[PDB]
């Protein structure tokens, strides 16, 4: 088939992990605006008919435990799985409230051989988090166990990701907006491509700090999908 079967009884789970406040032992900044993102995503994926579960302020231990338990559920009647991670990060890494956890450690639970009721089904990981500390100044028989994953990163590898304290993150703002406008029209990659354009063209940082001012962002789609994905 050219497209994933999406007419199982249920679209699937949408797990949203929303980390706003981090232990003093960590130092990390409180992520103002992230509640706007989490509420936007809840509504957006509700309209896509996902069973949304919001989780706030999870330690790295609780993140791993949550992902383990969800991967052990029976997803036989579900078309897909969505996980949204909202937090600080570094390349290859997401922060629990008390420290960093490896993305690979989270995603491994859902491998084709480790979560058999999601085998052959699309596993979507949506990640609003930094992937380093660079700034963009801008210009002008069997299947693989790693198949059928998609990682929609807010930013390019190595770079900061931007979040507005009032409006929410650039990426999630744009993601929800493009899903609301195009989920009944476009395949998911083409939706995420429009998200790339929106983030790349309509946003630019404003800062009193010259070092952080007038910066740009391009999201990064990492696709190991084997079929086209439509939400209708």
């Amino acid at each position: 088939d050219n497209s994933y079967k999406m007419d199982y009884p249920e679209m699937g789970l949408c797990i949203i992990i929303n980390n706003k406040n981090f232990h003093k032992s960590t130092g990390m900044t409180s992520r103002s605006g992230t509640d706007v993102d989490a509420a936007n995503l809840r509504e957006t994926f509700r309209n896509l008919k996902y069973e949304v579960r919001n989780k706030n302020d999870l330690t790295r231990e609780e993140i791993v435990e949550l992902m383990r338990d969800v991967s052990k559920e029976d997803h036989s009647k579900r078309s897909s799985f969505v996980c949204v991670l909202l937090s600080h990060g570094e390349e290859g890494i997401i922060f629990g409230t008390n420290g960093p956890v490896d993305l690979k450690k989270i995603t491994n639970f859902f491998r084709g051989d480790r979560c058999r009721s999601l085998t052959g089904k699309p596993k979507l990981f949506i990640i609003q988090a930094c992937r380093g500390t660079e700034l963009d100044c801008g210009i002008e028989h069997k299947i693989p166990v790693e198949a059928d994953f998609l990682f929609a990163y807010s930013t390019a590898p190595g770079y900061y990701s931007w979040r507005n304290s009032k409006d929410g993150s650039w990426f999630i703002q744009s993601l929800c907006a493009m899903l609301k406008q195009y989920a009944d029209k476009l395949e998911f990659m083409h939706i995420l491509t429009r998200v790339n354009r929106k983030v790349a063209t309509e946003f630019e940082s404003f800062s009193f700090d010259a070092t952080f001012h007038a910066k740009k962002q391009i999201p990064c789609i990492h696709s190991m999908l084997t079929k086209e994905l439509y939400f209708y």
């Binding site: 992520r31 600080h88 930094c130 900061y160 990701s161 931007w162 979040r163 304290s165 952080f212």
Partner: peptide
């Protein structure tokens, strides 16, 4: 605007 803040960074994550």
């Amino acid at each position: 605007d803040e960074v994550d």
